[PDB]
């Protein structure tokens, strides 16, 4: 569902201040030398144990709130590795855990020392020593706290990508129209600017196609390099293109108005097809209104066609400024994804044994419509006023009055008093609002 529920991670000074303020403010702080040595020992031992407990809770809360990278989906694990340097992330969490254990050991040692203390001064010195040691360990855990707070904030701002749903991954070089298409098909605010790398992260939008919800992932943008010197941005791009089963929309600009050569575009597509091993690939040609496909030399034209003549990569054309083919390309890709998913669900339901699954039986029952055997229908008593009516809209000047508007004018929801006799259809209209006798 997200990672916005991770509690804020304090700095070292804030951590020390919180722990010490709690240990002084939630406990009594007046012991006298004239009290029993056992009572003095109990007082100081209680102070040492409280400080440690507050610490272990806040350390355990930190350790348990942050996601564990192993148990996440491969996409999430790889994206977190790209974004936060997973190894150093784990090192920081391990330091938090080791500090927790060391503070626990300090508490046990000083509790035994307070057990065998003999004076109020000695007990005071032992308590001060234990508290100062804990503060020293936190002051050591200064920097990991800063790093973890930054990771927590970034994680709370990260988008929600469900790895296994109906997904449309729009990818390609910068300056091609990826974000333009994303805002055309979804209401996600993806920055659109004339420069090169305006999209510095993965963006998520959503759409509805034949009563189904579809995810659309805008990738930042990939350059034509071998995969070993790619930046973290295009590494997020390739991670999304690698671990997300979906329909890939690879965008190209036939016009060189993007700033990269067509030959390099086909080269990168060939390079990242092994990424696109089975996920369904549609090549979208954009800025046709700047230069359509026909206005191109035929060696490039046959190069594109030879790209088509392999697997099931499909060519479509569109323009994200005139809004010409965006609806058609969306419709086509969503329809093909839907039919593929329905076919694979049917094959999964039809097992080798031949026994029809319970859920497939249920869906067959839900799609089956039963009709009378005789084939005769029933008479329908729909009046004529309904087809003589006008559909209600909240924006028409001379609309219908409506009881909401009447009560809002004559008070509110708890103040308007309804006349239950206003619709009484009697013989004489003046007999309304009459007190009908009940007892005589």
């Amino acid at each position: 569902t997200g990672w916005k529920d991770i509690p804020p991670v304090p700095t070292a000074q804030e951590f020390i201040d919180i722990v010490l303020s709690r240990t002084q403010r939630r406990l009594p702080t007046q012991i006298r030398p004239g009290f029993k040595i056992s009572r003095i020992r109990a007082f100081y031992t209680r102070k040492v144990k409280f400080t440690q407990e507050t610490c272990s809770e806040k350390f355990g809360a930190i350790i348990s709130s942050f996601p564990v990278l192993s148990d996440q989906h491969p996409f999430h694990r790889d994206l977190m590795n790209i974004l936060y340097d997973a190894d150093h992330f784990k090192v920081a969490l391990g330091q938090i855990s080791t500090a927790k254990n060391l503070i626990e050991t300090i508490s046990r040692d000083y509790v035994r020392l307070l057990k065998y203390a003999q004076s109020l001064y000695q007990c005071k010195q032992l308590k001060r020593a234990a508290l100062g040691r804990m503060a020293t360990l936190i002051k050591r855990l200064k920097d990991p706290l800063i790093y973890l707070d930054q990771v927590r904030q970034h994680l709370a701002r990260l988008p929600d990508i469900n790895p296994t749903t109906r997904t449309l991954l729009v990818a390609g070089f910068p300056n091609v129209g990826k974000s333009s298409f994303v805002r055309s098909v979804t209401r996600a605010d993806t920055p659109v600017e004339p420069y090169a790398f305006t999209t510095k992260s993965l963006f998520v939008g959503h759409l509805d196609y034949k009563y189904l919800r579809y995810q659309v992932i805008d990738t930042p943008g990939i350059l034509d390099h071998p995969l070993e010197e790619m930046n973290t941005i295009e590494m997020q791009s390739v991670t999304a293109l690698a671990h997300l089963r979906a329909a890939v929309l690879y965008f190209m600009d036939i016009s060189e108005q993007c700033g990269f050569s067509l030959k390099a575009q086909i080269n990168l597509f060939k390079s990242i097809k092994p990424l696109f091993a089975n996920k369904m690939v549609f090549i979208v040609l954009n800025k046709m209104d700047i230069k359509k496909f026909e206005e191109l030399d035929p060696e490039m034209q046959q190069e594109i066609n030879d790209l088509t003549k392999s697997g099931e990569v499909e060519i479509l054309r569109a323009s994200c400024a005139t809004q010409e083919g965006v609806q058609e390309v969306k419709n086509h890709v969503c329809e093909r994804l839907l039919v593929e998913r329905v076919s694979q669900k049917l094959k999964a339901g039809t097992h080798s044994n031949g026994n029809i699954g319970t859920r497939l039986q249920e869906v067959m029952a839900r799609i089956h419509v039963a009709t009378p055997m005789d084939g005769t229908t029933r008479e329908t008593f729909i009046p004529e006023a309904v087809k003589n009516l006008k559909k209600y809209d909240k924006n028409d000047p001379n609309r219908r009055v409506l009881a909401r508007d009447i009560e809002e004018a004559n008070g509110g929801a708890g103040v308007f008093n309804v006349d239950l006799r206003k619709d009484w259809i009697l013989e004489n209209p003046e007999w309304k609002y009459d007190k009908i006798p009940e007892i005589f």
Binding site: D109, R112, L113, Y116, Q118, A129, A130, P159, D189
Partner: protein
């Protein structure tokens, strides 16, 4: 929202229409606020505030002096890391299964012999309430000292030993107790008090002697109050 959305909102719509003026006036009012805080708030909070202000003023004065000088103008960690890395190598890749056990404590022994002996003489148990060093675990003490009980919670085995000339502090095991300058009974019992000579294993330091050998034991003086501080601190006499 899914990215730096507050930054996007800033770029698209701006700030509140008087935020710059409010921030400037608050920053200008900060001086009176600081004086009011110094003169009004009271009780451990004023103490923390005063300590913080002292630290800030010292840092600012140091920065000013260093900047004036620079505008006019036109190892112990290493030895400790070497020692720790050697220890990690040995303990990680020369550690082999060995029958590793320990004897029972003098408290357990005393409880057992007390179950054996009904009539408890009043005060027959005196507990040594000072930190001690023992060495072995299941030792039988002479009848001279058999009733001195030294608890596990008070026993110490390692000390933070500082080499002055090779300026570095390392954690080293304690080999023996040579002289407690307060009591011969304490130096017999291994009581660790302030200014107490102990024998420390200095093998990890790699100190070269005159003949060319590595020192395996030196004298170190305990220079803290281990009864008040839950640690033993020694300075090496070299």
């Amino acid at each position: 929202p899914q990215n730096e959305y507050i930054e996007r909102h800033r770029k698209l719509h701006g700030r509140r229409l008087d935020a710059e003026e409010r921030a400037r006036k608050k920053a200008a009012r900060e001086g009176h606020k600081n004086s009011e805080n110094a003169q009004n708030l009271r009780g451990l909070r004023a103490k923390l505030y005063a300590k913080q202000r002292h630290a800030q003023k010292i840092q600012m004065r140091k920065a000013i002096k260093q900047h004036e000088e620079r505008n006019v103008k036109g190892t112990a960690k290493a030895l400790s890391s070497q020692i720790k890395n050697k220890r990690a190598e040995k303990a990680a890749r020369f550690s082999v299964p060995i029958p590793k056990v320990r004897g029972i404590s003098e408290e357990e022994m005393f409880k057992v012999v007390k179950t054996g002996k009904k009539t408890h003489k009043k005060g027959w148990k005196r507990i040594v309430t000072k930190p001690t060093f023992v060495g072995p675990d299941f030792t039988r003490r002479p009848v001279k000292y058999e009733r001195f009980i030294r608890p596990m919670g008070l026993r110490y085995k390692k000390a933070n030993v500082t080499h002055p000339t090779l300026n570095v502090t390392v954690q080293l095991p304690i080999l023996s107790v040579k002289k407690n300058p307060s009591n011969p009974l304490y130096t017999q019992l291994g009581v660790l008090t302030k200014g107490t000579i102990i024998e420390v294993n200095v093998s990890d330091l790699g100190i070269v002697t005159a003949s060319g050998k590595i020192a395996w034991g030196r004298y170190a003086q305990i220079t803290n109050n281990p009864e008040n501080d839950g640690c033993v601190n020694a300075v090496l006499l070299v």
